[PDB]
Amino acid sequence: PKKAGVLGSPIAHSRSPQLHLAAYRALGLHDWTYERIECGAAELPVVVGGFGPEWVGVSVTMPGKFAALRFADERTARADLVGSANTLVRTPHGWRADNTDIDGVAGALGAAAGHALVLGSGGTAPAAVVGLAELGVTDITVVARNSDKAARLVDLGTRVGVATRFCAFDSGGLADAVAAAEVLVSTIPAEVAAGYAGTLAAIPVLLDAIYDPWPTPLAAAVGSAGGRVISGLQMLLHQAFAQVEQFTGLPAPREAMTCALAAL
């Protein structure tokens, strides 16, 4: 019997246990548990440090992903690349940090090329840039409120081989940016994106990281226009596959987890 869970604040409405427990069931790991743990950044070392030996690893959501990367004694190249970790895995002597939000974006989209648009400068935005690059996107426009953080994201794009630029929200460049991109990944709150929904509506494909409440105004606008709409639930599904594999040592049971997501 082993233990896993998700660390975050807030955490009460996490859908991670539904996915992980569906997976453990399908794998015949019936005795494993997966718990929602209220945990902020400063509290992360207290909780993970206090884990007994039956803990195999934990998922980490906001606001602990930077603290998670620091707490680990070992970090994957991709976690290093995006600058934070949503996964901690127990190793013989310590903890390894990974970031599966990259898989979350790349897997939810399946494929992409040419030009992409990313809303937001922090959160899952770095993972989205890397995930987009991974799929073979060659040009990314970052649209964000924070111009300083956006420049850092732009440099990351450049460093994974992608022509990357910043476009301010209310600079009069957004329409041109939408017209040139084939896919939009939105990492900002639905409340912020809503006012831009009319301009963003024309995008051929939307991946909205938000999944609750649903639909977001942006999703409704794109869906109304006939664009492909992918909810945040798909990102959650695809980032969970790699965590299940690292926690269990077994292949992610994709059909069982997909059935659990449909219920979600």
Domains of the chain, residue spans: 1-100+240-264, 101-239
Contact 198, 220 (CB under 8 A): no
- Scored b (16 or more CB within 10 A) or e, 133-155 reads bbbebebbbbbbeeeebbebbbe
Tokens at residue 71, please? 């707490």
N-term to C-term CA, the chain: 26
Q: Is the dihedral of CA 162, 79, 70, 43 positive or negative?
A: positive
Q: Would strands 183-186 and 95-98 be described as parallel, antiparallel, or unpaired?
A: unpaired
Active site residue 2: no
Element (H, E) at 35: strand 33-38
Residue with tokens 């949503």: 86
- The three-state secondary structure class of 218 is helix
Separation of alpha carbons 240 and 247, rounded Å: 10
In sequence order, the β-bridge partners of residue 183 are 116, 205
**Distance, CA of 251 to CA of 253 (rounded, Å):** 6
ω into residue 53 within 30 of 0, thus cis? no
Resolution in A: 2.0
Decide: 15 and 264 in contact? Cβ < 8 Å: yes
Question: Measured between alpha carbons, how far is 102 from 129 in angstroms, rounded to an integer?
Answer: 8
Query: Which one-letter amino acid corresponds to residue 110?
Result: G
Method of determination?
X-ray
Q: What strand order describes the sheet that includes 3-8? A: 33-38, 3-8, 57-60, 87-90, 95-98, 74-75
Which CATH code, of 3.60.40.10, 3.30.700.30, 3.40.50.10860, 1.10.10.350, is assigned to 1-100+240-264? 3.40.50.10860
Alpha carbon distances (Å) from 70 to 33, 39, 44, 100, 167: 26, 16, 10, 16, 31
Contact 8, 64 (CB under 8 A): yes
Distance CA 202, CA 250 (A): 41
Q: Dmax of the chain from CA atoms?
A: 57
For residue 6, give the nearest of 91, 115, 86 by alpha carbon: 86
C-alpha–C-alpha distance, residues 86 and 107, integer Å: 16
Give yes or no for a contact between 246 and 57, defined as CB atoms under 8 angstroms apart: yes
- Nearest-angstrom CA–CA distance, 209 and 128: 10
Among residues 2, 3, 65, 149, which one is catalytic? 65
Contacts 24+ apart (CB under 8 A), 146-155: 146/121, 146/122, 149/121, 149/122, 150/121, 152/121, 153/118, 153/121, 153/125, 153/126, 153/129
Two tokens, residue 198: 């009319």
Which residues lie across from 165 on neighbouring strands? 141
- Are 206 and 227 within 8 A, CB to CB? yes
Q: Residue 201 carries which side chain, given as an amino acid letter?
A: A
In whole angstroms, give the CA distance from residue 200 to residue 118: 11
**How big is the chain, counted in residues?**
264
1-100+240-264 and 101-239 have identical folds: yes
Spatial separation of the C-alpha atoms in residues 72 and 114, rounded to whole Å: 36
**Strand (E) positions, 94-220?**
95-98, 115-119, 139-144, 163-168, 183-186, 205-208
Angle, vertex CA 254, rays to CA 249 and CA 258, nearest 5: 140
Which residue, among 156, 178, 168, 167, has the nearest Cα to 78 in the 3D structure? 156
CATH superfamily of 101-239: NAD(P)-binding Rossmann-like Domain (3.40.50.720)
Q: At what angle do helices 16-26 and 232-248 cross, to 10 degrees?
A: 50
Say if residue 217 is preceded by a cis peptide, omega within 30 of 0: no
Q: Please state, in angstroms and rounded to a whole number, the distance separating the CA atoms of residues 106 and 142.
A: 17
